């Protein structure tokens, strides 16, 4: 879909890059970024917060003639260790798979917000970029990024410049 | 020639994660769920100091082995600490009956 990320974009996880007659640069899409952050932050906290250990004491002492019990205690510790290790490894891998897909989904949704908003006033070129058929100055770029773009306003210029 | 591009943040992070399908995936941000640090000290549990018997074991301390006389007495203990080198108790050879049960009862 998109080849890689941007390093000049340092104000959030998701965003826009623009170039127009008056300037160029990067800016975060704050609503998208903050929602992704809150979702993920809560996810991480849930993984941690849900475990609630009781005050305990793990070690036990057995004597010369209590080997069967000592071995029972070992059996218990080993069983719990395998369960926790196995579940912990899988939980992390599963959550990581989803976190990364989650982020990819949000990028696509950001793209669609713009594609739907611009319609025929911009050429869709690829790799996350659009080109306006009509002149689109800083005021225009902000209205597209903000979801407030007026399609009809520029439709005459855009179709004239299409052919 | 006015244009607009949609994308995402990149960073200089070298932190990698594994996923179910992939290994060694670099991510911009990550959190560690596994604690691998300790402070190298024996601390108070819930505000109460351990009983440190040093070179004596519990039987030495309870019976009053002549070499455990120098140990101080705390009115409360959170846990008991013995060194691996501890070897003072039952100086007159013999069995200490239900020693493990006594040790368990005195732990706190």
């Amino acid at each position, epitope marked *: 879909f998109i080849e890689g990320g941007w390093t000049g974009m340092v104000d959030g996880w998701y965003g826009y890059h623009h170039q127009n007659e008056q*300037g160029s640069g990067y800016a975060a899409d704050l609503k998208s970024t903050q929602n992704a952050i809150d979702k993920i932050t809560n996810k991480v906290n849930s993984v941690i917060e849900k475990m609630n250990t009781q005050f305990t004491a793990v070690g036990k002492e057995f004597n010369h003639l209590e080997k069967r019990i000592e071995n029972l205690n070992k059996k218990v510790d080993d069983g719990f260790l395998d369960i926790w290790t196995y579940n912990a490894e899988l939980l992390v891998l599963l959550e990581n798979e989803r976190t990364l897909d989650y982020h990819d989904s949000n990028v696509k949704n950001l793209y669609e917000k713009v594609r739907s908003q611009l319609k025929n006033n911009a050429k869709e070129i690829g790799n996350g970029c659009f080109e306006f058929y009509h002149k689109c100055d800083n005021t225009c770029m902000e209205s597209v990024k903000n979801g407030t773009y007026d399609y009809p306003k520029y439709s005459e210029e855009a179709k004239l410049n299409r052919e | 020639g006015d244009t607009l591009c949609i994308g995402y943040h990149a960073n200089n992070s070298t932190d990698t994660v594994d996923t179910v399908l992939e290994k060694n995936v670099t991510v911009t941000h990550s959190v560690n769920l596994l604690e691998d640090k300790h402070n190298g000290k024996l601390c108070k549990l819930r505000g109460v100091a351990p009983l440190h018997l040093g070179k004596c074991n519990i039987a030495g301390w309870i019976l009053g082995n002549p070499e455990c006389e120098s140990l101080s007495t705390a009115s409360s203990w959170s846990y008991i600490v013995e060194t691996p080198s501890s070897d003072n108790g039952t100086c007159y050879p013999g069995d200490f009956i239900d020693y493990e049960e006594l040790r368990e009862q005195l732990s706190s």
Partner: antibody
Amino acid sequence: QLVESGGDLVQPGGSLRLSCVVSGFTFSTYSMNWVRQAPGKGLEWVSYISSSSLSRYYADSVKGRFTISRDNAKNSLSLQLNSLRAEDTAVYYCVRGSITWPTEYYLDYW
Amino acid sequence: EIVMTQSPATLSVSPGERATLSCRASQTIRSDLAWYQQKPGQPPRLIIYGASTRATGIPARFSGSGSGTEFTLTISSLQSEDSAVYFCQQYNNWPPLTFGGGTKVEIK
């Protein structure tokens, strides 16, 4: 890989057609620009066109006077210089831009 | 836009001597910078395409470095082949692309 024609010189108030043809590049996947080197001066960027032809930029110093068009089927880039001034006498170069347009644009082929 | 200047208008060292050039921006570039070496009568050649990352076909003699506004070109050993005019461009902010005036490197 790229042949350039500077259009020769005319007196101020006149006009010139400049043209470049490229054979070592697709000229459909790459943007192009013009850079002007006046004798005794530094290197000045003058103008830019994307391969879609929908995107063009000019230096303020040439706005309203210079214009760019291209024809991808001919591998050619055209620049029309109108209302020429003495200050416009310079060596003009055609430069093939980087492929990675939205980020790193460093003019790798002259 | 971003104004680029180059202070060391003349850099003149003996053959084989290490030498450097500086570039300064009025605004933060964040390594979105490129360096050129121009032989008389020729279009300039790209030597470093990033502020520091070397262009294809360029020898180890050249490398760069830099930060937000200050950038450097290092010539590890100036060769008889290297007298040239050097330039910095920027591409961090570019309706137009901009360049600094450029400086000359000469051999004693």
